[PDB]
């Protein structure tokens, strides 16, 4: 038999695999399939947090103009997260997707100025390039290595028209004077589900380099690399859709037989 | 609708179809009680098997399964062999033979390749069947492509029978995948399912196989166009709306 341990593994797997904007529907399907409310909110608490960190969930805090992203990089513990731009911690309710309890948080450090410079350039980059995108930029001393991590999210949820979509990108610049190494992953997921279930899942990896100069110049060079790469990626996706529509899809099946008319089923059945 | 099977089917509508097979497997693991009903209600990509006797390919799905064996439409035998596998009546087998032939021609005319199979089963006051079509690439081209057609028809004959009721539920699964330096990995996959029913005349000039063929052809032509709109129109527009 399937042990409860494999079961919880499954409920948690299903929840972490919910498409964008559909966490609640998936959670409630899994709730009803296990019929054990306290086991679920026990054995699956990790999955709720995992989902929101994987998805870069944006959240509005009462008191602050700027939304912030839930990511692994801002995990403060105890269901609390860092807002490095507004310089607060807040409580995040992973089930309700609700921010509460903002409290001032100390973000001062030697790297704050490089983080601030990258955050300023990035924020302008994001507002210009995404209809309602949000970004969060973190500064971490990781291997004694100073690292800037820029996370970008943009989603569009239209459940009433049976579709939801989300773009996430994650950009790591390890600030090792004189040549900083750049690593990114761009991801897209789109789900359409009127009378079916069609998804696009896409990702692209980026490797690059930039010369470390001043904070404001290094930031500008960082943003250029981001813009060029996110532009090429979007461009190429659309080129791929055209090619798929023009070639592969057309080859899988004809619109009609060579006669250019539907089948005469009498003639089929007669030989 | 709050019912467990409706929840399970709802999950299948939301979970990534890129993992369609493991999703079903995990779901049956979570709710074994529903194993038979999910095996019956959850479409899975078709798998191709080889009939040694006739040297013809056939397709595997839940509908031609008994235990761990599948029945061929060409030879009418199970693989691996079974001692009392479920068999259509001698009567219904003959129609299944006519239907397989008819749908092998339909496949050639629309698909110019691939593989077809038709499997019929008796019902109390008629019969039912599935018409399956699989057309893939071999995986060597830049853009990988696979089409699964799963057409499930229910025929309820009247007291003559010079009229019958046909209910058709059709699923097409379409899978496209490419790895290009410009776009990174791109996997656009999934399925659409539509249902219709019609009363038709059954006569020698319009037999069951003719009526079913017309319904399958009409429905498949419509789903093809909808797939084109959703895959290459709607999802692309959503992508471009994100940035």
């Amino acid at each position: 038999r399937v042990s409860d341990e494999e079961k919880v593994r499954i409920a948690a797997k299903f929840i972490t695999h919910a498409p964008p904007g559909e966490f609640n529907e998936v959670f409630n399907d899994v709730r009803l399939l296990l019929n054990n409310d306290n086991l679920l909110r026990e054995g699956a608490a990790h999955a709720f947090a995992q989902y929101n960190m994987d998805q870069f969930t944006p959240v509005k805090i009462e008191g602050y103009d700027d939304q912030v992203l839930i990511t692994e990089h801002g995990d403060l513990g105890n269901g609390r997260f860092l807002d490095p731009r507004n310089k607060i911690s807040f409580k995040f309710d992973h089930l309700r997707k609700e921010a509460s309890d903002p409290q001032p948080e100390d973000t001062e450090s030697a790297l704050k100025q490089w983080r601030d410079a990258c955050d300023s350039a990035l924020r302008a980059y994001v507002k210009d390039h995404y209809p309602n995108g949000f970004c969060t930029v973190y500064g971490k001393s990781i291997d004694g290595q100073q690292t800037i991590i820029a996370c970008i999210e943009s989603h569009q949820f239209q459940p009433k028209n049976f579709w939801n979509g989300r773009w996430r990108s994650e950009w790591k610049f390890t600030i090792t004077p004189p040549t900083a190494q750049v690593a990114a992953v761009l991801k897209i997921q789109v789900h359409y589900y009127e009378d079916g279930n069609v998804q696009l899942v896409s990702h692209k990896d980026i490797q690059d380099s930039v010369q470390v100069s001043s904070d404001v110049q290094t930031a500008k060079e960082f943003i250029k690399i981001i813009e060029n790469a996110e532009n090429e990626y979007q461009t190429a996706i659309s080129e791929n859709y055209q090619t798929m529509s023009d070639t592969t899809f057309k080859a899988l099946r004809r619109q009609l037989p060579v006669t250019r008319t539907k089948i005469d089923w009498n003639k089929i059945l007669s030989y | 609708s709050d019912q467990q099977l409706d929840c399970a089917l709802d999950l299948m509508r939301r979970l990534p179809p890129q993992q369609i097979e493991k999703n079903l497997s995990d779901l049956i693991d979570l709710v074994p009680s529903l194993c038979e009903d999910l095996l019956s209600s959850v479409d899975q990509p078709l798998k191709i098997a080889r009939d040694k006797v006739v040297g013809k390919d056939y397709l595997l799905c839940d509908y031609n399964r008994d235990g761990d064996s599948y029945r061929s439409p060409w030879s009418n035998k199970y693989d691996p062999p079974l001692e009392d596998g479920a068999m259509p009546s001698a009567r219904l087998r003959k129609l299944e033979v006519e239907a397989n032939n008819a749908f092998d021609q339909y496949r050639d005319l629309y698909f110019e390749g691939g593989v077809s199979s038709v499997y019929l089963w008796d019902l109390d006051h008629g019969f039912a069947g599935v018409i399956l079509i699989k057309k893939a690439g071999d995986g060597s081209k830049k853009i990988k492509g696979c089409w699964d057609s799963i057409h499930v028809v229910e025929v309820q004959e009247k007291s003559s029978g010079r009229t019958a009721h046909y209910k058709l539920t059709s699923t097409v699964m379409l899978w496209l995948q490419t790895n290009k330096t410009g776009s990174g990995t791109m996997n656009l996959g999934g399925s659409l399912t539509r249902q219709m029913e019609k009363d038709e005349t059954v006569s020698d000039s319009s037999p069951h196989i003719a009526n079913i063929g017309r319904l399958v052809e009409d429905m498949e032509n419509k789903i093809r166009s909808t797939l084109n709109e959703i895959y290459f129109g709607k999802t692309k527009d959503i992508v471009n709306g994100l940035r």
């Binding site: 009378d195 | 019956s40 539509r194």
Partner: peptide, 21 residues
């Protein structure tokens, strides 16, 4: 909230015989 037409399409009407497992 979604319709599930594959629940109400014809089903096998002898008793199947499950796969392993």
């Amino acid at each position: 909230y979604l319709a599930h037409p594959t629940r109400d399409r014809a089903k096998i009407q002898h008793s199947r015989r499950p796969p392993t497992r």
